[PDB]
Design a protein around this ligand. Sequence first.
Ligand SMILES: *[C@@H]1O[C@H](CO)[C@@H](O)[C@H](O)[C@H]1NC(C)=O
Lengths: 48, 48
Amino acid sequence: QKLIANQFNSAIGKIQDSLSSTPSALGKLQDVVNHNAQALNTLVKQLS
Amino acid sequence: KNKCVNFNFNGLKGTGVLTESNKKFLPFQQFGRDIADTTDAVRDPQTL
Ligand SMILES: *[C@@H]1O[C@H](CO)[C@@H](O)[C@H](O)[C@H]1NC(C)=O
C-alpha cells in the first residue's frame, strides 16, 4: 500500500509539472478559440 | 451631434451619432478607420 501511494503521489506531481512545462499540450482546446475568433475576423473583412 | 444625424464630410457620406473623440490624429490625417476597415473617426473640415 505504501509503495502504491508513493508512486501515485509522484505521478500526480509529475503530471502537474508536465502541464506547467509543455505549452502545446492544450492545443486541442486552443485551436478551437484560434478557429472561431479568426473566422469572425474574416466575416468582418467582407465589409471591405 | 449626439443624435442619429446623417453626415456628409467632404464627400464621405454616413449615418450615426457624432461624439467627441480622444484619439489624436497626425497633422495630415483626415479619416479614421477601425479594425473593421470602416469609417469610425472623422475630422471636421471647418474646425480641426
Ligand atoms: C474656417 O473659418 C472659421 C471661421 O469662419 C475658422 O474658425 C476656422 O479656423 C477656419 N478654418 C481653417 C482651416 O482655417
